[PDB]
Amino acid sequence: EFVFKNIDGYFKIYSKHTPINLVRDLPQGFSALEPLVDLPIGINITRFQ
Amino acid sequence: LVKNKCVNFNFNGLTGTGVLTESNKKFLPFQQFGRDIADTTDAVRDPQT
Ligand SMILES: *[C@@H]1O[C@H](CO)[C@@H](O)[C@H](O)[C@H]1NC(C)=O
C-alpha cells in the first residue's frame, strides 16, 4: 500500500508492506503506513496512471 | 555530548534546557523527535551521533 499526497510544495510518498492471509479485498486489521520517501519537488499533478 | 548535567541545548534552531540521558524508548528511522503528552519535546535524536 502506498499513499501519495502533494501539499505545500513537496511531494510525499508513504508505504507499508504487509503479507495478507486472505486474497479477497483488503485486510480489516489496522496497519499504519510509515513514510518511506519524501521528495521536495514543485511539480504539479492533476492526473496519475 | 554532555550527559547527567543540566545544560542549555540547541538542536537545529530548537532550544531547551535539561539533563540529557539516553532514552530506552526506541523509534523508527524516519522520526527525528519525540514528544510528551503535553506536546513538549520529551526526546531528541542527536544529528551527528
Ligand atoms: C497546478 O495545478 C492546478 C490544477 O491543474 C492548476 O490550476 C494550477 O495552475 C497548476 N500550476 C500552478 C503553478 O499553480
Swiss-Prot record, chain A:
It comes from the Viruses. Glycans are attached at N44. Changing I20V: In strain: Omicron/BA.2.75. Binds to host ACE2. RBD also interacts with the N-linked glycan on 'Asn-90' of ACE2. Cleavage of S generates a polybasic C-terminal sequence on S1 that binds to host Neuropilin-1 (NRP1) and Neuropilin-2 (NRP2) receptors. Interacts with host integrin alpha-5/beta-1 (ITGA5:ITGB1) and with ACE2 in complex with integrin alpha-5/beta-1 (ITGA5:ITGB1). May interact via cytoplasmic c-terminus with M protein. May interact (via N-terminus) with host bilirubin and biliverdin, thereby preventing antibody binding to the SARS-CoV-2 spike NTD via an allosteric mechanism. Attaches the virion to the cell membrane by interacting with host receptor, initiating the infection. The major receptor is host ACE2. When S2/S2' has been cleaved, binding to the receptor triggers direct fusion at the cell membrane. When S2/S2' has not been cleaved, binding to the receptor results in internalization of the virus by endocytosis using host TFRC and GRM2 and leading to fusion of the virion membrane with the host endosomal membrane. Alternatively, may use NRP1/NRP2 and integrin as entry receptors. This is Spike protein S1. It comes from Severe acute respiratory syndrome coronavirus 2 (2019-nCoV). The chain holds residues 191 to 239 of 1273 of the full protein.
